[PDB]
Amino acid sequence: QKYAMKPGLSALEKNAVIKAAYRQIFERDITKAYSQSISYLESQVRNGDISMKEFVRRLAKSPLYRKQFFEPFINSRALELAFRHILGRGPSSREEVQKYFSIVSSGGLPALVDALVDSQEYADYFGEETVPYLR
Ligand code: NA
Ligand code: NA
Ligand code: NA
């Protein structure tokens, strides 16, 4: 089951695409109703002013994402969570854990998100338009 945001999709499909995005990132049925920010963000991705990649990015940086999947955890644990939500897999090696560990110490949640989202792997699997999915 793969979902991709494109500007000319029907509203039914767009709704389905957005819903998948929240479920993959927040692991629950968040809605535009949750905050001004998320609603604004949703309007951006729905209208094509930002791509799906950019939507995932801003979503993963949000206070909701931060309080559920970053703030309560040690660097080590927060990065494996972000891996799963953004990349659809767990970290593959101790060398990869280390790479992202320093990024987290260095630039916290925003740097963790940017790095996962801007990796060549993310580009290969999900690109600009596709919701991350469990691999
Ligand atoms: Na914003
Ligand atoms: Na939020
Ligand atoms: Na940032």
Swiss-Prot record:
Post-translational modification note: Contains one covalently linked bilin chromophore. This protein autochromophorylates.
Domain called PBS-linker: residue spans: 1-135
Subcellular location, record wording: Cellular thylakoid membrane
Highest taxon above the source species: Bacteria
Subunit structure: Heterodimer of ApcF (a variant beta-allophycocyanin). Phycobilisomes of this organism are composed of a two cylinder core, from which six rods radiate. The core is mainly composed of allophycocyanin alpha and beta chains and of minor components.
Family to which this protein belongs: Belongs to the phycobilisome linker protein family.
Protein function: This protein is postulated to act both as terminal energy acceptor (by its phycobilin-like domains) and as a linker polypeptide (by its repeats and arms) that stabilizes the phycobilisome core architecture. Has intrinsic bilin lyase activity.
Protein name: Phycobiliprotein ApcE
